[PDB]
């Protein structure tokens, strides 16, 4: 869970200048760090960030010695991110005129990690190096660095302005590749990112993540067969974990505010009635029948809790998707560390899959939960297999509405040309590509990989308000609109079919 | 279909209605009263805004607007309630029969023309809009006027007039010692004379069984959740209606009553500052949120502006193969999309073309959905839905589009990694046998909500002052005994073949 990140940057003059046609590398690094810190602040994962810079006239390190380990300042030690850090990076971070070797920067970062790590359970440690590799490399202590890094289990990542470079930059890239190969080997070549690539990924706030509670029960078929199972929630409509707090417009405090409820009778005198003399009731047609809460509990429907029973087995065709109810989808696995339960559940899943059948079951979360009737159907993948449970309707929840038929309606019978235009439209706006080599469908517009725009908007507005207290809210970011819209190719291809459809179909607003 | 259903219960009060052919059997009057009470209870539960009335003919007393003779209007057209059921409950037995005879009287003459006139007059008094008008005639006399031909002609003329006005007449014939012959007189009065309803009936009509079948589920009339605009492009727009064919049924909300007289009490919530103690309008407060050891303050209007993305409607995005859709990606109950020609003319043709070609090409229309204002967009897939009819030509699957909500990345969750242990073919075969033994046919209306049914039973018992509440049979409970009988030794063989000798699943 916890993770300590030591961002080691540089402020050397070598980045203060660059080609005017592109943004300076220093600006790119600043933007990357700002985006990362924003994500950490608005994703409360309890991770910690420390900030070190090498290439500044100041000298503040735990280890000084002689000329070595100089020109390096530990700007910010290891604590939880806060808006003060964002302000610091906004102004305090300033360029410089001196150079330095990124090896010493790595040494000081490792020293800071080692010194401050004790006392906390930080299970992961990442150090990110932002350097242009313009300065010379004092390769004289590589072996000890590698030994220490492997002993301490510390990960290292690099960020460069390039994915037409000077020979010194080439030498820097070579030494970096050597270090990464020593640390991890081949895969390390994928841990060196560029500024454009990093800015691509860090433009979206971290998605709201919650942990599902493991729900144990026993799947029963009859009165003698039982399989120990654990259920988790796979799909649910996510909501913000924090809610707005009403505050007083002047003192800006919630302690000076509180709500009250007043009950009164149906009379001109407007008599006041206390909460200890209000009974519960219902309306039975044209009258009202008292029904106290105590008697309601006495006469309530009482059921044994935590039931997962198999009412029966039905063909998959008889259970249709349009009838699914509820607000959640459950994934049912065998109980953890139980081989017998795993074998039993695998047998049931495979049997149902082979016979093309699903299990109609009864579900009750606990004693206080209303009973439910649902469908459990098999889900077999190349690595994992399980049951998937979704609720099914009752008699009272079904609505019998009658609608006129359009196929045999003389008034609204389409012609051949209209149908051809619609066919052309459907073929032009295809959102899936059929690769013939693999004969496979590729999704051009995957909706399940788009973060909820609502949380993006909320966090953007909150951040803008925190950093600009007196200012109107901004508009929706362009990239949000881009990720809620289809790729430009689909829009480009669909213009002519749409014009044809407009021509053939008369539509008159009324 | 707009308005309310109006129903009038005509009950004969002649002598022949108060005699029991067998010792252990119900008199026609008792059967009629039971049916009336059952319909009253069904209406209270299902449609509480409908109008019901109860009239008697053949009595000695009279009570009507026209001051006719031998016609007692017991209850004029009004919404159902417990008081009326209790009022009818005093004629439910032999002592109730004596009470009815004392209060009103029986065994007198009558004219069907006057009875139908009183029923029509009752219909006229209603000031609401009535979608249906119905009269049910509970009688066991097939020839009410055999001696007088003029009365028969008057009754025929009045029945014809009532039919012209738009009043349905139904005959619920009860058991007669000699048998009931509709052929004699009631053919002309009845609204519809079925071909099979011509032979002499020696037993009460089959409609009484349906009347006594209590309906305890709310029946909601057709209604559109929203009328939206489907926008294929900035210029091509059609009008659609969104409906919900599946909606969760909830208990009616409780009301707060005063204990000393059972009169409703109204509630009001207000917020006042601690120091001054005065009321604070909603305009004198702000909103706050803590993040990164800081307090962020926003006004309410901005808080609502945070949610504004696009105007209400459906925006087309493209078309997707139906294979890419997944069944385990369920997020929210699906909706129904149908054309609507009231707002835009020509929508039906384009909708039909899209439906036909989507069915032919097996594709679903991907769209961005914003139901109301100030609601962030969701992604929906419109899956074509063809028209499917059952044997009796009653439509069971309407034509249109099924709107299915697709999840965002935040709506899914990560599962703990679990090693897979596959089953050998023998275990799968034994479990296949077990599955095949417990096969059954499933229908969407094969189960009832135990909680709601018990709630309605309890409410009825409390209202009508019954001895004990009726207990509902829970069909969701497994039939353990039958399953054990059917499976036989399969369970033991499977347990031997899949579980070690010392496993103890319970522990």
């Amino acid at each position: 869970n916890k993770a300590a990140v030591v961002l080691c940057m540089d402020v050397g003059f070598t980045m203060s200048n660059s080609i005017p046609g592109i943004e300076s590398p220093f600006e790119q690094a600043k933007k990357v760090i700002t985006m990362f810190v924003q994500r950490q602040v608005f994703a409360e994962n309890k991770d910690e960030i420390a900030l070190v810079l090498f290439g500044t006239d100041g000298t503040d390190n735990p280890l000084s010695g002689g000329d070595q380990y100089q020109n390096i300042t530990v700007h910010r030690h290891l604590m939880l991110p806060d808006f003060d850090l964002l302000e610091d990076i906004e102004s305090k971070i300033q360029p410089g005129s001196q150079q330095a070797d990124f090896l010493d920067a790595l040494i000081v970062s490792m020293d800071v990690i080692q010194h401050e790590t004790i006392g906390k359970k930080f299970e992961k440690r990442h150090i990110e190096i932002f350097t242009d590799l313009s300065s010379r490399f004092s390769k004289s202590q590589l072996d000890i660095i590698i030994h220490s890094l492997k002993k301490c289990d510390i990960s290292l990542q690099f960020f460069l302005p390039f994915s037409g470079i000077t020979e010194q930059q080439k030498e820097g890239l070579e030494i970096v590749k050597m270090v990464m190969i020593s640390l991890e080997g081949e895969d390390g070549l994928d841990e060196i990112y560029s500024f454009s690539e990093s800015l691509r990924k860090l433009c979206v706030f971290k998605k709201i993540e919650r942990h599902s509670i493991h729900w144990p029960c026993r799947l029963t078929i009859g009165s003698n067969l039982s399989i120990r199972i654990a259920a988790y929630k796979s799909i649910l409509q996510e909501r913000v974990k924090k809610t707005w707090t009403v505050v007083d417009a002047k003192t800006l405090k919630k302690e000076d505010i509180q709500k009250e409820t007043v009950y009164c009778l149906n009379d001109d005198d407007e008599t006041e009635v206390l909460k200890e003399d209000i009974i519960q009731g219902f309306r039975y047609g044209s009258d009202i029948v008292p029904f106290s809460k105590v008697d309601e509990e006495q006469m309530k429907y009482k059921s044994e809790g935590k039931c997962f029973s198999v009412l029966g087995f039905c063909k998959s065709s008889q259970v249709q998707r349009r009838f699914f109810m509820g607000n959640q989808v459950l994934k049912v696995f065998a109980a953890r560390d139980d081989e017998a339960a795993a074998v039993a559940l695998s047998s049931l899943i495979h049997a149902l899959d082979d016979l093309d059948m699903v299990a109609i079951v009864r579900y009750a979360y606990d004693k206080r939960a209303n009973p439910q009737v649902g469908v459990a159907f098999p889900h077999i993948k190349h690595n994992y297999e399980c049951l998937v449970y979704v609720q099914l309707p009752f008699m009272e929840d079904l609505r019998q509405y009658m609608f006129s038929s359009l196929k045999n309606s003389k008034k609204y019978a389409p012609t051949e040309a209209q149908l051809n235009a619609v066919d052309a439209l459907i073929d032009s706006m295809s959102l899936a590509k059929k690769d013939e080599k693999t004969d496979t469908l590729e999704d051009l517009f995957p909706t399940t990989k788009i973060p909820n725009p609502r949380f993006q908007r909320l966090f953007q507005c909150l951040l803008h308000r925190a950093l600009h207290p007196r200012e109107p809210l901004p508009p929706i970011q362009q990239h949000i609109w881009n990720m809620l819209n289809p790729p430009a190719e689909v829009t480009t291809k669909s213009q002519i079919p749409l014009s044809k459809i407009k021509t053939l179909f008369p539509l008159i607003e009324a | 279909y707009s308005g309310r259903d109006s129903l009038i219960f005509l009950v004969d009060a002649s002598k022949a209605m108060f005699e029991s052919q067998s010792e252990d059997e119900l008199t026609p009057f008792d059967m009629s009263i039971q049916c009336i009470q059952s319909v009253y209870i069904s209406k209270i539960i299902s449609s509480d805004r409908d109008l019901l009335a109860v009239v008697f003919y053949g009595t000695e007393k009279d009570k009507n607007s026209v001051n006719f003779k031998n016609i007692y209007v017991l209850q004029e057209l009004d919404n159902p309630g417990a008081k009326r059921i209790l009022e009818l409950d005093q004629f439910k037995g032999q002592q109730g029969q004596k009470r009815f005879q004392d209060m009103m009287g029986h065994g007198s003459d009558y004219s069907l023309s006057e009875v139908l006139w009183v029923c029509a007059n009752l219909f006229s008094d209603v000031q609401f809009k009535m979608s249906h008008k119905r009269i049910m005639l509970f009688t066991n006399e097939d020839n009410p006027h055999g001696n007088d031909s003029a009365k028969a002609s008057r009754a025929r003329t009045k029945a014809g007039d009532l039919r012209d006005t738009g009043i349905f007449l139904d005959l619920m014939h009860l058991k007669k010692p000699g048998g009931f012959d509709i052929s004699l007189f009631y053919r002309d009065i009845i609204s519809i004379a079925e071909d099979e309803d011509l032979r002499v009936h020696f037993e009460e009509s089959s409609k009484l069984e349906d009347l006594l079948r209590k309906v305890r589920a709310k029946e909601t009339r057709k209604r559109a959740l929203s009328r939206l605009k489907l926008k294929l492009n900035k210029d091509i727009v059609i009008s659609v209606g969104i409906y919900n064919l599946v909606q969760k049924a909830l208990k009616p909300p409780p009301i707060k009553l005063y204990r000393e007289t059972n009169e409703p009490v109204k509630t009001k919530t207000r917020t006042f500052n601690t120091s001054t103690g005065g009321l604070l309008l909603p305009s004198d407060t702000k909103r706050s949120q803590i993040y990164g050891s800081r307090q962020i303050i926003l006004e309410k209007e901005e808080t609502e502006e945070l949610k504004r993305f696009d105007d209400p409607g459906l925006m087309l995005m493209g078309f997707k193969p139906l294979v890419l859709l997944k069944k385990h990606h369920y997020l929210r109950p699906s909706l129904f999309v149908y054309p609507e020609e009231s707002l835009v003319i020509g929508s039906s043709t384009l909708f039909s073309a899209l439906l036909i070609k989507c069915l032919e090409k097996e594709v679903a229309a991907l769209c961005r959905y914003t139901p109301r204002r100030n609601i962030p967009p969701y992604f929906v897939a419109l899956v074509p839905q063809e028209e499917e009819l059952d044997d009796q030509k009653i439509q069971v699957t309407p034509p249109g589009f099924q709107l299915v909500f697709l999840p965002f990345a935040d709506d899914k969750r990560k599962m703990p990694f679990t090693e897979k242990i596959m089953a050998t073919p023998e275990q799968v075969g034994k479990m296949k046998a077990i599955v095949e033994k417990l096969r059954f046919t499933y229908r969407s209306d094969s189960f009832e909500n135990p909680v709601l049914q018990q709630h309605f039973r309890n409410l009825e018992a409390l209202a009508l002052d019954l001895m004990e509440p009726e207990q509902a049979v829970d069909l969701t409970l497994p039939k353990v005994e039958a399953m054990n009988k059917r499976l036989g030794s399969l369970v033991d063989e499977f347990k031997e073949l899949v579980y070690p000798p010392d496993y103890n699943p319970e522990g």
């Binding site: - | 349906d210 009347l211 417990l438 069909l475 039939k479």
Partner: peptide, 23 residues
Amino acid sequence: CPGESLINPGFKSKKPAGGVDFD
């Protein structure tokens, strides 16, 4: 028209809930 409700006109007479009826 066929199989219409005698209590609520305009609605089809729902068949009673049958639960599980094994074949």
